[PDB]
Design a protein around this ligand. Structure first.
Ligand SMILES: Nc1nc2c(ncn2[C@@H]2O[C@H](COP(=O)(O)O)[C@@H](O)[C@H]2O)c(=O)[nH]1
Ligand SMILES: Nc1nc2c(ncn2[C@@H]2O[C@H](COP(=O)(O)O)[C@@H](O)[C@H]2O)c(=O)[nH]1
Ligand SMILES: Nc1nc2c(ncn2[C@@H]2O[C@H](COP(=O)(O)O)[C@@H](O)[C@H]2O)c(=O)[nH]1
Ligand SMILES: Nc1nc2c(ncn2[C@@H]2O[C@H](COP(=O)(O)O)[C@@H](O)[C@H]2O)c(=O)[nH]1
Ligand SMILES: [Mg+2]
Ligand SMILES: [Mg+2]
Ligand SMILES: [Mg+2]
Ligand SMILES: [Mg+2]
Ligand SMILES: [Mg+2]
Ligand SMILES: [Mg+2]
Lengths: 177, 173, 173, 177
């Protein structure tokens, strides 16, 4: 499809393996993962299991780009971590588009005085203002992840995703309350 | 001896629970993900049902007579809200019990629980679950922890992992 | 009918508790301040005893059959630590009980409690306190909340406050 | 004293009244107070009671300037707040010296996209890089607050503070364990 990239779970595992493999090549084994909620949740958990990283923390930050709510920049809603001083930190997200979210998170994490902050995203857009330190693939269309496919379907009746009928039947019932 | 759900099955597990919540007419205001096994289930359930508020509790259970230990609770007020606690497996049931007990202290309008899978000997049954299973469940999100314990478990992509793990052993720490 | 401690008395209350902790040989690893009445006592106690780790719990009790309601818990791991929960007054004792109960879920090595003042009818007695008092205590940190309730309470600087409060009523909201 | 300012509790109350009075003059009634832990704790609580402000949140941030630990800039250890979007926020600290702490906190709070962020400190030093939006007095010596007087005494056997003998007897016992 020209307008969407719809990766399978197998591609997501390949993406996470690739990040892990790159981390080991660079000898950057993080002390702490910072998952960018909520798109970075699954990537961070999978990477954590892959590399036996026992410490995951979280930042709730969102780039509002919808009909109901539109903003110019990412907005932090909360930061879920204690001291990161002297730690090697890796920020993990599912995709860097403009790169503003990773920049915002990097900036705020740097205020915790870690030993090092680096960034990882599964996917990168050509127009991103900064290349993440670690990434799996550059792609120039909108990515539909397995964990936000139904949000896309809700906003877009056209898109072809697996299990759509089962979802529509459920969504239908939700809409009637 | 082992149950190793595909991502396809995990999706069906989440669909199952989402359908039960809808059929039973319980639509959560807030999901509490039990870290870290519950975070992928919670995320998938949030997407399916369009639940915009996910909060988290860092809790651990060192099985061998232990009790669950809370390390942190990441949430603000839950008062007056319908909460669904979400975890990946209910084995002893201690974790869900502990989480429900602390969430109740936030005076929500209701707390219910959900886990993808349930063990026969669980002291408490989740309000919502996909399947009860006798075998040891290897999740897509903890398959390498299991392999690092026993290398001979029959999971896919094990060679790619062992390749990586080998290098990892040399550079850490 | 009223007890209105000076800052001098508050200091002596904190000294009293600090001396009791030292005499009794319990030196906390972590203070849990019960927000918001406990935060000034906790800060003063932290300075006296050189306690560098203060954490917090946002909890409220709407007296008229209610229960304390937790709004958030601000702490990471307490496991293996000696904790002292700190509040300004123990009236019904429900708040301290609730806080102790949730902190125990973090598996600390010990939780003890402290409040500056104690009411005769408290269901639970703080492990450390300064004085039991029958009167309604007006703290230096909630004197204006009391005045806003009843203007005729005998606190100092009330005219400066009413002057300010009057302007405040006009511009809010 | 040329080297220390040691305010009484009555002066602290005067300071908090003055901030409150200035807030009302400016018609800036905050929705949320951000207390800068731990020096801003007492000022924020007193201001909260004074102006009936029911929402107080917290940031744990420290400027290490001691023998045991020295740093160039403030370091955030944790941020205790949920969404501040669209709120009028007032950052409250006990003193602005270099002004780096208030700057750091203002910067991070601005990432939460509040309607407005302003700052208040009881005291201001002449060499501060920015004047807080609200303050009680400018002073050019080290302030010993009622809530960190014993920390000063521990680091400095000379300073004259009330109740020192009672403290030394206690400190003595602490040191022997
Ligand atoms: N599903 C999906 N989410 C995206 C896409 N691009 C950006 N996002 C979301 O927006 C953030 C990145 O936006 P940025 O700040 O890089 O513009 C990420 O945290 C990600 O969750 C996309 O193509 N597909
Ligand atoms: N991957 C996996 N972990 C399990 C399984 N059964 C129990 N556990 C772990 O063992 C504990 C069981 O106690 P409970 O989860 O009921 O508190 C939890 O820490 C849980 O993560 C299982 O079948 N598969
Ligand atoms: N200022 C003040 N507040 C009190 C006094 N007694 C009770 N309260 C308030 O009433 C409640 C008493 O219940 P408890 O504190 O034991 O949970 C708390 O919310 C406490 O702050 C008092 O004597 N003075
Ligand atoms: N006790 C005391 N603390 C100070 C003094 N100056 C700065 N501080 C502490 O350091 C911070 C301000 O430092 P700045 O970032 O403005 O250099 C405040 O949060 C305050 O707690 C002082 O003169 N006396
Ligand atoms: Mg995102
Ligand atoms: Mg998104
Ligand atoms: Mg778990
Ligand atoms: Mg209280
Ligand atoms: Mg300070
Ligand atoms: Mg200081």
């Amino acid at each position: 499809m020209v307008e969407y990239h719809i990766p399978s779970w197998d591609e997501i595992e390949d993406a996470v393996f690739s990040i892990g493999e790159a981390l080991v090549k660079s000898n950057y084994i993080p002390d702490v993962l910072i998952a960018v909620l909520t798109g970075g949740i699954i990537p961070a958990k999978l990477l954590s299991d892959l590399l036996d990283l026992k410490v995951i923390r979280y930042i709730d930050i969102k780039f509002y780009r919808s009909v109901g709510k539109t903003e110019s920049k990412p907005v932090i809603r909360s930061v879920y971590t204690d001291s990161l001083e002297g730690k090697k930190v890796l920020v993990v997200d599912d995709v860097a588009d403009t790169g503003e979210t990773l920049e915002a998170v990097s900036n705020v994490i740097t205020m915790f005085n870690p030993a090092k902050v680096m960034t990882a995203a599964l996917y990168l857009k050509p127009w991103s203002k900064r290349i993440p330190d670690f990434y799996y693939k550059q792609i120039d269309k909108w990515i539909i992840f397995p964990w936000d496919k139904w949000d896309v379907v809700r906003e877009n009746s056209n898109v072809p995703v697996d299990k759509k009928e089962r979802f529509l039947n459920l969504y239908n019932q939700l809409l009637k309350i």
